[PDB]
Design a protein around this ligand. Structure first.
Ligand code: HEM
Length: 289
């Protein structure tokens, strides 16, 4: 099973920058979503969920085939809430219908990260829409009620090591949980990409509680929350060391997240030797827009 990247016919960096810009301008404009968090976090979650179906063992799933557009994956219980991201990107696809679904979903996550003042994330084009029978079955995305050993084992399937896992989880600085989506009670939320997830873990006074959906989560007096899987990053001594490293080095966290997030988004894709180099998109700010 090989998924070869194929550049959308006649497209180059500037075509993709125009798509990035449309997404970025829309992120700026539609600012009321989710109590004024905006769509940035759900777009990052969308990019992760369409990528996180990958299985290194047989090369099924992953971002390549754009399969989230099909009902089986769209309706995965693990994807509840992501419809909001799909709806946001719909008009962008309508404006730029030449771009593949996988390229659009992944670029939405890159654009969101960068527009939320996160690291630059190099991004490659050439995901190709594959047919409905290529859609992975539900059940490949991770459970939140689990411990550090679950986390570690889970991410082996995505070929992620401890550092990559801890860096990727730093995206939980963004946005929040919603009881109605995931059975987790949301806490304090932000829409700026920083290393604060790690700072929160280390500095807050956490108490384990059971929420109204009967799920356990860690809650701080300050109004913050952590999933059991988030909290597992300070219970495991290998993960804890990395948490401390990122809490104490913003630049290191940015550079590690960038690498890990690009890898996540590219898992399963074979890039021909003469494929274009990765694109680094300018933010709206850098363009004076
Ligand atoms: C053990 C792995 C993970 C688990 C169990 C997990 C679980 C969750 C859960 C339960 C939610 C709340 C969904 C809702 O109620 O709306 C959430 C939201 C989110 N997740 Fe994760 N996640 C994991 C890894 C990641 C990774 C690797 C990324 C990105 C790199 C990510 C980015 C986000 C974002 C940005 C949101 C917020 C969505 C919003 O505000 O609407 N997650 N995740």
């Amino acid at each position: 099973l090989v998924h070869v990247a194929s550049v959308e016919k006649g497209r180059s960096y500037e075509d993709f920058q125009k798509v990035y810009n449309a997404i970025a301008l829309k992120l700026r404009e539609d600012d009321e979503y989710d109590n004024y968090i905006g769509y940035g976090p759900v777009l990052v979650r969308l990019a992760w969920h369409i990528s996180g179906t990958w299985d290194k063992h047989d090369n099924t799933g992953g971002s390549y085939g754009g399969t989230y557009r099909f009902k089986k994956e769209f309706n995965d219980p693990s994807n509840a809430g992501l419809q909001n991201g799909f709806k946001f990107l719909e008009p962008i696809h309508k404006e730029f219908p030449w771009i593949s679904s996988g390229d659009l979903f992944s670029l939405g996550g890159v654009t969101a990260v960068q527009e939320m003042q996160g690291p630059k994330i190099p991004w490659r084009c050439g995901r190709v829409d594959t047919p409905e029978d290529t859609t992975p079955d539900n059940g490949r995305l991770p459970d939140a009620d689990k411990d550090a050993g679950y986390v570690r084992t889970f991410f082996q399937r995505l070929n992620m090591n401890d550092r990559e896992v801890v860096a990727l989880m730093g995206a939980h600085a963004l946005g929040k949980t919603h009881l109605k989506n995931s059975g987790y009670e949301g806490g304090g939320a932000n829409n700026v990409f920083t290393n604060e997830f790690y700072l929160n873990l280390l500095n807050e006074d956490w108490k384990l509680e059971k929420n109204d959906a009967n799920n356990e989560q860690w809650d701080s007096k300050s109004g913050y929350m952590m999933l059991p899987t988030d909290y597992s990053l300070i219970q495991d001594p290998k993960y804890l060391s990395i948490v401390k490293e990122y809490a104490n080095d913003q630049d290191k966290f940015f550079k590690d997240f960038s690498k890990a997030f690009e890898k996540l988004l590219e898992n399963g894709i074979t890039f021909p030797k003469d494929a274009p180099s990765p694109f680094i998109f300018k933010t709206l700010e850098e363009q004076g827009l």
